[PDB]
Amino acid sequence: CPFGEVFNATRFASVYAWNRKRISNCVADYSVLYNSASFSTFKCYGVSPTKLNDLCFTNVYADSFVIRGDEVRQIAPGQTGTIADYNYKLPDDFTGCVIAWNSNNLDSKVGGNYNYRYRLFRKSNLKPFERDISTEIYQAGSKPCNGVKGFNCYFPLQSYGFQPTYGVGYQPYRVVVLSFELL
């Protein structure tokens, strides 16, 4: 029963360096899901979320991260935004559960948290599940800026700031993406 070291982990990874875990060689209970109802967003694509006990899957994945409040609805097949296009892009044939809940007691600071970055600039869009960790400088202007970080030369990993007193929209939401597949 290994679904107890991804949901209540301690420190979820940032959006651009999004965590992962491969579950295999054990059968799952699927009682933490859809029976405690502690999850706000539960948009389970593909399989219907209630009949998972009588199914048995192998080599499923539990990649998880923590994003801002008003961008939870970009973790979805085909949606375009600033974190579904530059950080973590779901594919069109996804079959799993996109779980998400508010965690404002655990991932915010008085004065900005600043450790949960997001890739603001890139040369092009992302592929399905393609992660980027490189911190090369963008040089948005036509002049080649060789790591000077000045005019038209930005650090591409701009930082979130989660303060505890914002509104709904600007709040940390530890999304976990169960990503089941056949065989």
């Epitope: 992962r20 592929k127 599940f129 960790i133 490189s134």
Partner: antibody, heavy 118, light 104 residues
């Protein structure tokens, strides 16, 4: 589910073009990769190709030598080396990750013996 | 840049053995191991440093997390005489490790 490679023999001044065949899945969605193997010295990464559009990645040591092209229709992968030197006498591999994106390498291929000494 | 401890290794049949890989940076449990018979390609043996790929028996109890990693084949038989590798997945380029060989 399994890859298929070839065999070659080239001149020390000419250029070589490798090959790798993919079958058993959809070719245009996983990243075909290339690693090299001299006798000893471990392994080193060369690059990776994405057959949807050809979004190649590389290493600076092999940048300018490795040209990673592919074809979605024939479901085969290629790479081409140029201006061969004495260090390139080695056996090359083509490999695929298990799932999309970020995982281990699972599906390998057989060896491609290439000698470029004389 | 990965590194190994022993380039060659001498351990008998009835004895246990441990193979180590130290990493340059901190890579969050994103390494593999391999097993290269001298004729054919290296096959995937332990993925994500703790899970076991299919086709591999329950001998190879791979562990290790953070910076240092450990692969423990418990009771080595006569067909597990090959080359053992390491990797890392997150930072480009995908740098490998040194080749260690298990012998008698």
């Amino acid at each position: 589910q399994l890859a298929q490679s070839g065999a070659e023999l080239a001149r020390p001044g000419a250029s070589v073009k490798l090959s790798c065949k993919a079958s058993g899945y959809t070719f245009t969605r996983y990243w075909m990769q290339w690693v090299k193997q001299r006798p000893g010295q471990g392994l080193e990464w060369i690059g990776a190709i994405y057959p949807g559009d050809g979004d190649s990645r590389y290493t600076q040591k092999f940048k300018g030598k490795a040209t990673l092209t592919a074809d979605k229709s024939s479901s085969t992968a290629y790479m081409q080396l140029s201006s061969l030197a004495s260090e390139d006498s080695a056996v090359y591999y083509c490999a695929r990750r298990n799932y999309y994106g970020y995982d281990a390498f699972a599906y390998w291929g057989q060896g491609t013996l290439v000698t470029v000494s004389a | 840049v990965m590194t190994q401890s022993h380039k060659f290794l001498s351990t008998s049949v009835g004895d246990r053995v441990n193979i180590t890989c130290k990493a340059s940076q901190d890579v969050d449990t994103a390494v593999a191991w391999y097993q290269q018979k001298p004729g054919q390609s290296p096959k995937l043996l332990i993925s994500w440093a703790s899970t076991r790929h299919t086709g591999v028996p329950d001998r190879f109890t791979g562990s290790g997390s953070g910076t240092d990693f450990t692969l423990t084949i418990s009771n080595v038989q006569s067909e597990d005489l090959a080359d053992y590798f390491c990797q890392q997945y997150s930072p480009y380029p995908y740098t490998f490790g040194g080749g260690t060989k298990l012998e008698i």
